[PDB]
Amino acid sequence: MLRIAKEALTFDDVLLVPAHSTVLPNTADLSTQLTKTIRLNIPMLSAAMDTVTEARLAIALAQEGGIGFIHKNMSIERQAEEVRRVKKHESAIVRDPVTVTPSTKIIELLQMAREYGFSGFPVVEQGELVGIVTGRDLRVKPDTVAAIMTPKDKLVTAREGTPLEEMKAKLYENRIEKMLVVDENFYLRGLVTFRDIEKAERKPNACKDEQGRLRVGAAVGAGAGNEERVDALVAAGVDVLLIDSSHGHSEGVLQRIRETRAKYPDLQIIGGNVATAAGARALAEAGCSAVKVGIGPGSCTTRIVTGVGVPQITAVADAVEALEGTGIPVIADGGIRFSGDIAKAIAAGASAVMVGSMLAGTEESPGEIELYQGRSYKSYGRVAYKGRLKEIIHQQMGGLRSCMGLTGCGTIDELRTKAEFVRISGA
Amino acid sequence: HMLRIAKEALTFDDVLLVPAHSTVLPNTADLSTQLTKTIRLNIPMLSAAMDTVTEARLAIALAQEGGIGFIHKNMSIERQAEEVRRVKKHESAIVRDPVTVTPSTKIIELLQMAREYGFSGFPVVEQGELVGIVTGRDLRVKPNAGDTVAAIMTPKDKLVTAREGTPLEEMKAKLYENRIEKMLVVDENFYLRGLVTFRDIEKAERKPNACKDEQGRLRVGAAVGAGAGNEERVDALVAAGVDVLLIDSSHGHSEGVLQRIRETRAKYPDLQIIGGNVATAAGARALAEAGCSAVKVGIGPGSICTTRIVTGVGVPQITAVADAVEALEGTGIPVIADGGIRFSGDIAKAIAAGASAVMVGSMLAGTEESPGEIELYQGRSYKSYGRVAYKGRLKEIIHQQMGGLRSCMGLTGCGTIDELRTKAEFVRISGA
Amino acid sequence: GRVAYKGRLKEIIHQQMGGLRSCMGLTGCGTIDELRTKAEFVRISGA
Amino acid sequence: VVDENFYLRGLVTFRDIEKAERKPNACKDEQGRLRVGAAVGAGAGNEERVDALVAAGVDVLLIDSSHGHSEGVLQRIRETRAKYPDLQIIGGNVATAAGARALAEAGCSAVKVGIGPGSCTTRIVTGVGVPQITAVADAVEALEGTGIPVIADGGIRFSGDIAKAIAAGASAVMVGSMLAGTEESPGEIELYQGRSYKSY
Amino acid sequence: MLRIAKEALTFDDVLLVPAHSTVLPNTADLSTQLTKTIRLNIPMLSAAMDTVTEARLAIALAQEGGIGFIHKNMSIERQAEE
């Protein structure tokens, strides 16, 4: 009769305690296991929201050390292509060069030579690379390009995914200043020079897989009928799959995860959302590589409409305590205002945090930049323009680094286990 | 004895333009106009010599849209003269800091470099003077120990180069016909200045409305004070190649301002000179005879601007521009409207009042190209140096304002700027 | 019943006569009697 | 009036001595001179600044950082106490019993308390802080035998908060924004919108 | 797991209790040891802030019974001279 389980605490009810510290903020280590097999370089994920994460933003976040989740409010064919866009992103490769076909008339070949120079036009037949035709090819003679082009068997090419230093070596050792880039089927994918490799921005903190590719996630619904979407994302090379619903403790959610884990025994899977120790055990039992926590975590509409929610400090600690033996990490999702809340979510036991509205309106998130009343927006009903995602990550991990300097926790894992709280009041 | 009221004076809010029969499509309206007798703009816009608005980056961005920007004077003479040179020399098709060797460079260091930068061609420079180049073709013969590049390089006389300022199509002609992949850019004294390729010329964003001088160079302006002691500044700006000099003060009908202008016209007979600010027919005529090529109008234009509140002085702007234009009729000295411009509608009213162009300041602060660098602060983007709202690229704002000006010229049937200045009419409206 | 402290009277005089001096340079009235007799007005609207 | 090197420093008459304002409550040293403090950073490279302040006759030296429990802060204090065994030293800021013991152990003559003490930006950005009544009582309780006093720094709005900081065990309070804008603080008096300011 | 050290109180969470008093406010003694060797006549120090304490303010506070702290946002030679 009147069944109060316990008291639950939110971010604003606690503060972290300063401790003896030998940690400089700038020497603090921000890396963390997202799953047993995936390690992030900063403890941050972007939400699968149509105003936050598509391929552009997911690329920019992976380059800073985290992982973005492509939202599902798009066709299967388009979402899988957003995942491929992140997996195959290399800044040094020039895409869409000017090409010809083996049927191109020499007179056309000369009209373009005067417009683009005669260094070498790739010859393609339906996207398959078949050769290159240079000025030497024409001015020494044998009508159509096929009769004069340098053939496939004398081409010096690199495969997509070749490291920049290997590509520089190939260019040097074959004495070439252009090198065409092909896929496994010898389809042209771009080209590289020494100069394009040089101005490729270097990203030392990028979260990359064992092949050196940026890591990416994608979201699917927990409903039935998503099997075609899941198989397309896995086949696209997604690193981690997000099965998200508003009630992760639902039995049809637990069943959908069990079925994906049986089909892909090695696929890294995140499920949510839960807010109880029992909800987290149930998701780990279904086969999750990680557990996302957040059902009405802060002063939200699920609470107003349904009556339901657990304040976020308690939700994260209960889930972390339910999972303690398993090497299955907890993600704190929702309610993250300032960098102080990131530090508190982690000290409560979370291994990473997911953020959403904080990143909408950045340069890389979806939407067009719009000028309206002399002030900058991203429009698609508009959100403030917040500049580059790089600067916001800098501001938020600065504050986390300061928190670790203050609590004497030099790594995320120490913050999660060693840092302490005091309980404070409203006034 | 008698309250000396010279006349009634009208502001922008007091009048509306009358729509006319029109064969003008807004997107076919001709926006070009004369700034002085010798300088033609492609859009009727200038950026103010404010330290929060105009330095070299914004002045380039604006010349590339068809206007001119004025480098503010709140920096050293050497800095302001460098800002002017940056605009006149700007061509994004030229790669600017290439890796060079010297005749003294060992072949071994050269091979080390060729592994990092390729062998397309290292410029050989001694003291800044271009003296040769070394490509991977020039090397073929096994080097001995301690060999220098001077042995194998291509000499100066066998080089194909192009002078800075050469039209980009001429450089393409030269790259193609000489069968070269890159070409070195030099200056009057054969000092190495950069290089071009077919790809760098392609990648440069095209700007058909760029406002350029008869040598193809972007135009630029610069401001100085009217006080004594700005002689050296003016000489340094002229020497930098500035296209027009702005001698600015808060009272351009002041005798010391007029004197400074006579002295600059005396020293620089062909220099294009803008003077301001004035708000009467007599101030404008006085500045014409001192030697101005154009006249800038605007004395306490806004309702609550500080000059009006502190000094009581001002003339509402519509009357002040009509007053000055009528003074200058038949002189080919254009009038510029400075200050009080809120919307794109205020631009069209200044021109139909007779002005040949308008000057804007704070509308452009906080753009990407304006000074300051971007700061995120409380979920919003600003430019910090006290912070102004980040407004995006200058091109978007120009587009929006000229879109509102084009829409007016279709409404009034004025297909050119001179038609608007002479043909379009007004209705006087009340405050209700 | 309390009014804002405004500092020394000299500072306020300075500021107001600075604004009056700026006007006499604008209108070219070098004395007060020149301003009283020579300077002119424009009639403006409420807009 | 001359100094020790017979350099002229001023003069006095009967009238100037008479109109010298009398200040019965002045905090003065054993020589009758006003007492003063000076602040230095807790970082490395401040040894030239410290030696110049001590040589200037500073009465008490303030070694202040945002994390007084930092190990490089504790080490910097240990090094100053070895060099000037008699110099009065204040270190901060801490907010725990352990932080205060560590500062007293390093050689502090007094301990300044205040890490995010009231509803402040260290709390918002880092997540860290201890409310100020608890911070002061814990430090005072950690120092109870030592004759090393506690200063309550930060969060002091009204005179009621001064009384509460002291009842919690603090021996003095430090205040800042309460005194900016006074006649004597830095800055020039400025009239702006008929209202008086100190501007910089 | 979820490590709450304790509850912590702020100025607004407590009030002082009135007690039996033989103290007149104007006869209350405000002096206090700042260190074992330094005694203040009022329990107040001014902060080492560039907008608060330089020599002028530090002189005016010492004359009232406390001690001011010259801020360090200035050259060594200037701070020692303050």
PDB file of N, CA, C and O in Angstrom, chain B residues 109-127:
ATOM      1  N   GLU B 109      69.354  15.816 -49.926  1.00  0.00           N
ATOM      2  CA  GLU B 109      68.218  16.451 -49.272  1.00  0.00           C
ATOM      3  C   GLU B 109      67.046  16.574 -50.239  1.00  0.00           C
ATOM      4  O   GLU B 109      65.881  16.413 -49.851  1.00  0.00           O
ATOM      5  N   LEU B 110      67.353  16.825 -51.514  1.00  0.00           N
ATOM      6  CA  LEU B 110      66.333  16.955 -52.547  1.00  0.00           C
ATOM      7  C   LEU B 110      65.539  15.669 -52.709  1.00  0.00           C
ATOM      8  O   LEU B 110      64.312  15.696 -52.821  1.00  0.00           O
ATOM      9  N   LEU B 111      66.226  14.528 -52.742  1.00  0.00           N
ATOM     10  CA  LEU B 111      65.536  13.245 -52.788  1.00  0.00           C
ATOM     11  C   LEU B 111      64.706  13.008 -51.539  1.00  0.00           C
ATOM     12  O   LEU B 111      63.632  12.403 -51.604  1.00  0.00           O
ATOM     13  N   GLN B 112      65.213  13.420 -50.384  1.00  0.00           N
ATOM     14  CA  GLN B 112      64.406  13.336 -49.179  1.00  0.00           C
ATOM     15  C   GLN B 112      63.120  14.122 -49.332  1.00  0.00           C
ATOM     16  O   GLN B 112      62.053  13.696 -48.871  1.00  0.00           O
ATOM     17  N   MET B 113      63.214  15.285 -49.964  1.00  0.00           N
ATOM     18  CA  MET B 113      62.065  16.164 -50.091  1.00  0.00           C
ATOM     19  C   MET B 113      61.083  15.614 -51.113  1.00  0.00           C
ATOM     20  O   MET B 113      59.864  15.717 -50.940  1.00  0.00           O
ATOM     21  N   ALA B 114      61.617  15.033 -52.190  1.00  0.00           N
ATOM     22  CA  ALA B 114      60.809  14.468 -53.256  1.00  0.00           C
ATOM     23  C   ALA B 114      59.987  13.294 -52.774  1.00  0.00           C
ATOM     24  O   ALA B 114      58.945  12.993 -53.358  1.00  0.00           O
ATOM     25  N   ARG B 115      60.451  12.604 -51.732  1.00  0.00           N
ATOM     26  CA  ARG B 115      59.633  11.566 -51.122  1.00  0.00           C
ATOM     27  C   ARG B 115      58.465  12.164 -50.354  1.00  0.00           C
ATOM     28  O   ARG B 115      57.412  11.527 -50.231  1.00  0.00           O
ATOM     29  N   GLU B 116      58.623  13.388 -49.858  1.00  0.00           N
ATOM     30  CA  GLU B 116      57.563  14.060 -49.130  1.00  0.00           C
ATOM     31  C   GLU B 116      56.650  14.876 -50.038  1.00  0.00           C
ATOM     32  O   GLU B 116      55.435  14.920 -49.811  1.00  0.00           O
ATOM     33  N   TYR B 117      57.193  15.498 -51.078  1.00  0.00           N
ATOM     34  CA  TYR B 117      56.439  16.416 -51.914  1.00  0.00           C
ATOM     35  C   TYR B 117      56.345  16.002 -53.365  1.00  0.00           C
ATOM     36  O   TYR B 117      55.750  16.734 -54.160  1.00  0.00           O
ATOM     37  N   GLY B 118      56.928  14.886 -53.742  1.00  0.00           N
ATOM     38  CA  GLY B 118      56.927  14.504 -55.129  1.00  0.00           C
ATOM     39  C   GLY B 118      57.968  15.263 -55.897  1.00  0.00           C
ATOM     40  O   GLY B 118      58.663  16.123 -55.380  1.00  0.00           O
ATOM     41  N   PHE B 119      58.066  14.932 -57.182  1.00  0.00           N
ATOM     42  CA  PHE B 119      59.099  15.471 -58.060  1.00  0.00           C
ATOM     43  C   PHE B 119      58.542  16.332 -59.185  1.00  0.00           C
ATOM     44  O   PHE B 119      59.208  16.514 -60.206  1.00  0.00           O
ATOM     45  N   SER B 120      57.332  16.857 -59.035  1.00  0.00           N
ATOM     46  CA  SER B 120      56.756  17.686 -60.085  1.00  0.00           C
ATOM     47  C   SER B 120      57.604  18.921 -60.380  1.00  0.00           C
ATOM     48  O   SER B 120      57.653  19.368 -61.532  1.00  0.00           O
ATOM     49  N   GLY B 121      58.300  19.458 -59.383  1.00  0.00           N
ATOM     50  CA  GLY B 121      59.263  20.509 -59.635  1.00  0.00           C
ATOM     51  C   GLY B 121      59.518  21.364 -58.418  1.00  0.00           C
ATOM     52  O   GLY B 121      58.580  21.955 -57.876  1.00  0.00           O
ATOM     53  N   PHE B 122      60.774  21.411 -57.955  1.00  0.00           N
ATOM     54  CA  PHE B 122      61.149  22.264 -56.833  1.00  0.00           C
ATOM     55  C   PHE B 122      61.739  23.552 -57.373  1.00  0.00           C
ATOM     56  O   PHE B 122      62.737  23.500 -58.102  1.00  0.00           O
ATOM     57  N   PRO B 123      61.173  24.712 -57.057  1.00  0.00           N
ATOM     58  CA  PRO B 123      61.801  25.973 -57.475  1.00  0.00           C
ATOM     59  C   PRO B 123      63.141  26.189 -56.785  1.00  0.00           C
ATOM     60  O   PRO B 123      63.270  26.023 -55.569  1.00  0.00           O
ATOM     61  N   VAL B 124      64.146  26.563 -57.569  1.00  0.00           N
ATOM     62  CA  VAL B 124      65.462  26.866 -57.027  1.00  0.00           C
ATOM     63  C   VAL B 124      65.558  28.374 -56.849  1.00  0.00           C
ATOM     64  O   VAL B 124      65.555  29.131 -57.825  1.00  0.00           O
ATOM     65  N   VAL B 125      65.678  28.809 -55.600  1.00  0.00           N
ATOM     66  CA  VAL B 125      65.659  30.218 -55.245  1.00  0.00           C
ATOM     67  C   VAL B 125      66.974  30.549 -54.560  1.00  0.00           C
ATOM     68  O   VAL B 125      67.475  29.760 -53.749  1.00  0.00           O
ATOM     69  N   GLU B 126      67.555  31.688 -54.922  1.00  0.00           N
ATOM     70  CA  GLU B 126      68.673  32.256 -54.183  1.00  0.00           C
ATOM     71  C   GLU B 126      68.330  33.690 -53.799  1.00  0.00           C
ATOM     72  O   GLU B 126      68.203  34.561 -54.668  1.00  0.00           O
ATOM     73  N   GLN B 127      68.142  33.921 -52.502  1.00  0.00           N
ATOM     74  CA  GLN B 127      67.857  35.228 -51.921  1.00  0.00           C
ATOM     75  C   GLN B 127      66.463  35.737 -52.261  1.00  0.00           C
ATOM     76  O   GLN B 127      66.152  36.905 -51.989  1.00  0.00           O
TER      77      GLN B 127
END
